[PDB]
Amino acid sequence: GPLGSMEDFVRQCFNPMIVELAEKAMKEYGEDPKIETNKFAAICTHLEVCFMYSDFHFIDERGESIIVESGDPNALLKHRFEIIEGRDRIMAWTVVNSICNTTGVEKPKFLPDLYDYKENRFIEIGVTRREVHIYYLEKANKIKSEKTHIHIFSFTGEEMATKADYTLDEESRARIKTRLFTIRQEMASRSLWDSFRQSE
């Protein structure tokens, strides 16, 4: 088949909000989404996973954890997760500081991806083109001491998470894996996959 551009793929297969947040992040770190395209695509994927991870997850009127698949449910419900990823450094740390002061949880040394109000812990999400058991150790060895929960997804369906605690129901994580599988397959059809995979 003909080789497509990764730029084209990213803008077509991710929602404009994801793309825009990704572009801003790269710029913030001084990179151009039109040159570092595999990095661009990786950042978009990781962002979407972060969003899908928090999607449809609230804490109910009684203070337990529920699932609502519409936007029409009750405005008294609080989102179970805070989303840290996607914010610029200043705002990201502002949110982390607010969380840390309210709940009294310890301040992480690096920006995490999410905060879980039910479990009362920060979460580091990862998405790897390599073996999850390996990527996990890389992430695990950076955070040093740990209250931060780590959850790794791959494009082939494997997961690994701290202490075998996977946080979410099977159905939610199946959604994420399906999306990753769909991303991988579509890249393959544009002959973008093999290059993307080797670039990590």
Ligand X SMILES: Oc1cc(-c2ccc(-c3nnn[nH]3)cc2)c(-c2ccc(F)cc2)nc1O
Find which of Mn ion, ligand X, none residue 183 binds, CB within 5 to 8 Å per kind.
none
**Number of residues located near Mn ion, criterion CB under 5 A:** 3
- Residues near ligand X (CB under 6 A): 25-26, 29, 38-39, 42-43, 46, 85, 113, 126, 199-200
User: Would residue 85 show up in a list of annotated catalytic residues for this protein?
Assistant: yes
Task: Give residues preceding each break in the chain, C–N over 2.5 A.
Answer: none
Q: How far is CA 138 from CA 5, 29, 135, 144, in A?
A: 30, 21, 5, 11
CB neighbourhood size of 122 (10 A)? 27
Nearest distance in Å: CB 115, Mn ion: 12
Region 106-125 residues binding Mn ion, contact defined as CB under 5 A: 113, 125
CB 23 within 8 A of CB 83: no
Enter the DSSP assignment of 30.
T
Find which of Mn ion, ligand X, none residue 96 binds, CB within 5 to 8 Å per kind.
none
**Which is the catalytic residue, given 48, 85, 116, 124?**
85
User: Would residue 124 show up in a list of annotated catalytic residues for this protein?
Assistant: no
- Catalytic residue numbers read 85, 113, 139
